[PDB]
Amino acid sequence: GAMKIGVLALQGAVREHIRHIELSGHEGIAVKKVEQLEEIEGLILPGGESTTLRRLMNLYGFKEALQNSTLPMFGTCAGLIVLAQDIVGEEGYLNKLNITVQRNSFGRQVDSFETELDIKGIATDIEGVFIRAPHIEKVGQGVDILCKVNEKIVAVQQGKYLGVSFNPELTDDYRVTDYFINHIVKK
Amino acid sequence: GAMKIGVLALQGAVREHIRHIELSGHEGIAVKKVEQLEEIEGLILPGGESTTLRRLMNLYGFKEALQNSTLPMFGTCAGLIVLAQDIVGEEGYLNKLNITVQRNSFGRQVDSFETELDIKGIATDIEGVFIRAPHIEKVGQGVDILCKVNEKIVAVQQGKYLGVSFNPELTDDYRVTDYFINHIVKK
Amino acid sequence: SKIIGSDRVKRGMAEMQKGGVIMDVVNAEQARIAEEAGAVAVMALERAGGVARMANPKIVEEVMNAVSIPVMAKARIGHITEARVLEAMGVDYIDESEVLTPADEEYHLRKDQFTVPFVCGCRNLGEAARRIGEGAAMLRTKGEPGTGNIVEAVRHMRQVNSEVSRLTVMNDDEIMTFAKDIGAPYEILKQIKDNGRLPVVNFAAGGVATPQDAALMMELGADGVFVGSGIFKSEDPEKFAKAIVQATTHYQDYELIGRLASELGTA
Amino acid sequence: SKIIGSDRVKRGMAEMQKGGVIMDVVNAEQARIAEEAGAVAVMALERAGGVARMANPKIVEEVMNAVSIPVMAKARIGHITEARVLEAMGVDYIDESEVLTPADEEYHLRKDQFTVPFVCGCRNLGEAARRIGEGAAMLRTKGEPGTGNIVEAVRHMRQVNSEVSRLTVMNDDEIMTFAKDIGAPYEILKQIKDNGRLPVVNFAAGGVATPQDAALMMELGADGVFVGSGIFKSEDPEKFAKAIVQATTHYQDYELIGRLASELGTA
Amino acid sequence: SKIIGSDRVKRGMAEMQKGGVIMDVVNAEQARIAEEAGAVAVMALERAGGVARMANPKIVEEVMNAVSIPVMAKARIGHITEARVLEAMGVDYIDESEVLTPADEEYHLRKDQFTVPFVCGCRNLGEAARRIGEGAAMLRTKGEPGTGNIVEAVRHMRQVNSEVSRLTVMNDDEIMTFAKDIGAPYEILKQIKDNGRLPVVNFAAGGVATPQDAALMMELGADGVFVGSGIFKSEDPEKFAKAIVQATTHYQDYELIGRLASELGTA
Amino acid sequence: SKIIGSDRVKRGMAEMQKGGVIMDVVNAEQARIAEEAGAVAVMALERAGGVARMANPKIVEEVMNAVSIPVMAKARIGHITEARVLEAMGVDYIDESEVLTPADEEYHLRKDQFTVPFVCGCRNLGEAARRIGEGAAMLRTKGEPGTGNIVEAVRHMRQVNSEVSRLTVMNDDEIMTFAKDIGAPYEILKQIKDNGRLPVVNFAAGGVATPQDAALMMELGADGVFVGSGIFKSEDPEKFAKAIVQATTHYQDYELIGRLASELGTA
Ligand SMILES: NC(=O)CC[C@H](N)C(=O)O
């Protein structure tokens, strides 16, 4: 019934993800220590600064604990970067999604935007907010491409792993977290 | 499941009765107009001034509506006076409980008190607060005497009608309202 | 056993009094009208012209023997023996009233020594918390008695309500100096924030003179109305008191209030 | 469907009222004269001597049933239940009037909660913008009621007119601190500059007592005239009200105004 | 379509920035350390001795090309062309900073005309609401920059937090005059009470100099920490910035903060 | 079971500390001298020249591992995370010290949330009662630290002693307003009068610099002596500290104090 879903509370919009978890009818846990990973059935890597998030995960055993964990994951911006196997110009981190992603494909904040997104299998009018968002350059075998914007894909799903370039937590539409919890963690 | 219980919100401790209803797992409705009586499955006549309560009920059709209503009732102090068929020195009002009750049997407020009460069928340590409370002088046929204090009975139950001289709403113990809702209204 | 005098009993006597109006009274025949009009209690009293004292015990007993609703009498500020005499008569409530000429311009009564509950006037959270600390079991607004002007009652009610609402959501680190700023007992402010509401019942008192500004007090957050002698200054005190009761209990039936105001027609 | 209560309806009730004069009224027979004299509406009221309240609903209904033109009644400042009772009676406009003794010396009414439009007094762009923000749907000058001295009406009208004219051509960079200086809602000032005029109708009210200074108000920029009881203090209230209507509608026919003034001859 | 410049995007750029520390930077090699230490953004700047202006676009571009985290630059108060030039360079945030010598001692920038979000300093709910009304998309405490004394940051944070907490539970009737008292736009206060929190992110800025009072800011309610040049005034700026990041993210692991403080050892 | 953190334990840690002197310490070898001189505890610290913070945890651990007597460290006023970090290290006492630059110029620490006892400075019964209400488990005089002038310590000790002696025999009717006059929690004053003494231990602190004015503090009513620079600014700290201990324990053996003063001979 009521499932406990964790949000990596190292840095970023953790309150918004916890609120969206509570909107889906579940309990949210802001995880800051590795031990809390043993108390949740799902993990959301929230939006923030991928550099800061990497630096924080590398210092408390989070990288080794999450590289070896069998927990399903939902990465937004930065979280998608952290989940990718390869990063253009840098190196892959958690190596969970067989994709190659480039950081800051659009302009800087003076070029961030909002739009409507038709995500395959969720909804046809998701309110997507792109804030210096990355884009997925290449996909591997077994990676479903859920949503693209101008031939540049931004939303993918590989089995029990879900990655998006936009940040749905900043909106009042909680359908993405609902889909993640009810069709990935509940499977 | 969740039952709507009404409290006569003409005068008296209505907030406390609504709180105790909410503590029992049900919804409370502060009834001030006769029409609201059609929306509740049970009625609580709260503690207050019996004179003011009579004067308010006589002026909005509440006396005729409640004398003809088939709704179960729970009267505390004043509410017990209003529910009685006979009142020493005065006249009976709603004529719901076949009992004769005397108002202000103890002293004035300089003689009000608290005590422990062993109510037959509820609990053995109810926290009873008597504030210029009446006492039931005589009982009729079919009136169960639930609790007495100093040979003066103060808690009775006749079928779907429950009367008490004390005010349990002023305490944190909500067992009396719970018993009323679960064993009288739910019957 | 018989836990008589517990604070819960003192403040429950007034907590199960809210929703009604207490009108003051001079003689037994006015108390008859007050009772038969729906008043929850009567304020027995005798009378910028001199020094006001306690109402003679004879008149208080005359008012007491005439009604079955609770009767409360007024005592001078800090007057120990006056409140003690009112307690000996069995009076249900003593009003440590600033309307009467005070007896101790510095120190209020030691209300927690008595077994009879007290009601005191307040204009902000500071005075209210101080009265509660001294042992008061009920609060009212100081207002402007004898003027029919609701301005002061509104001001005091809104002030104390806004201050307690601020305190209910105030940081725990900031409460202490807050108690230092408004001159209030600190533990009482902590209890206010813990309970989430004012630990005692606060009524309106002062400029209430029409059904409109009697229902306005309940609309503003007051739990009841203290009405002065203006009731017996109209052409028909019976209908006036009845309309005040109706407007106090149904403070949001505006057509009812309009009809009651149309019925009345005096100053 | 039925978009009832939209701000456009509230302020249109007064926007299609400009060009005429609203004279106050005490009884039905004065309302007859007001209607048959060309008044666009009547101000139903009952009366430095005491505390002024709402006019008894009986007299307001007596004035209401006597005329087909809109009737408006006065409510005390910040008096919630008074304005609510006037709303329940169907009164077309409530004047949150500072002439009556206020009820809340700190906070005005929450006018946007009501479905009946309100009219409030103002002396500068600050008070006007604050009243508009609180939900007022009409504005008038505070003036000096009961004196017949037009000085205060002229002063307030000219002040608010000069301030809104300044704001209509004021730099966008300077508006915010301007709103901070006059104590006004900032979005309302932006809307003022965007629309180019005052977002609501501003009437004259106070010292109007002759046709001359009734036409002077329209010459100064007012949209209408609020006239007090001085009409029924003359030798012929009918001719006086008729002349006031004529001078308000044709405020630049000076020979007509001269003839009307020659006809009249009282204080 | 492509709703670029919408307020939600402006303030989301900072809302998904909370939980981290923004340390200022002078040259590219300091920005490298800031990025590799866990900073969420860098404040590009050049330097009681003269008049401070914008940091030369050359040095801002040098800092920009060295890091992938967002870089923000400082502009003079009310300096239109300075903020416009910083916007043309693609700077992620402009700080309408009171640290630099102002350019308009009366009127702040017209921040809602820009498509780049702004961050402004505040000391109470009044200044914060005024900055939000002018179009600011982020707030920080004014503090006492260049002193290492946390007193002013604590004071401003606690003041604005207590005031917004008061407003979240404040009566709807009293808000307007409240906005008049603190000199704030009224609609912004209504939106504050409706949302229940401050409509934008408020960071700490000023006296932050140790990990202890960096975690204290997060304990007090701040969403992040603005750190000055003191990082590069220690013996090891890398370890200092790393410890500040650690204490900002885990502001309640007190043994961790103790170890980080033991490691550091400078002024 | 294990009733850890009860107020009786907090204040007993200091109640079984009276009769001895706590001298502050910078490094391990000075703590060695302090222990070998008869000190009951040491005050670990690191240092009108800047902003004073917490003493680096490294130096506090260095002092901790060097002695078996309790070691106490200083935290900034209202600094939550500083006191929490000192608590995590196992420090026996935290001094919410006004000597260090404060962190919250308005609100003191929430001392009753901690499980480690606190010591605070006071200058009158008001400040003492406020600190106790906030949860302090020990009191000292503010004095004039770093001056060697005993005037302020004498003044504060005598003031608080005279005020508590007045309260011990003060009328029950007058206590409440008394608490209002000195700005103190009322229940704490009632507890003071009930116990007949100050509910916690009050030490001397500040101008102590010779054995004479160290024994004078015990003669005046102090329970112990906090010594600052009086020992670690002389030519011979060992003999100086030994003489201070002797004069503190035998504060009425005047020939002994004279001999100890003859031995010493510096500023
Ligand atoms: N998540 C964001 O704020 C986007 C920018 C960030 N530097 C990143 O690419 O991870």
Ligand SMILES: NC(=O)CC[C@H](N)C(=O)O
């Ligand atoms: N309910 C009470 O407050 C008790 C006294 C009241 N007059 C009565 O007997 O009804």
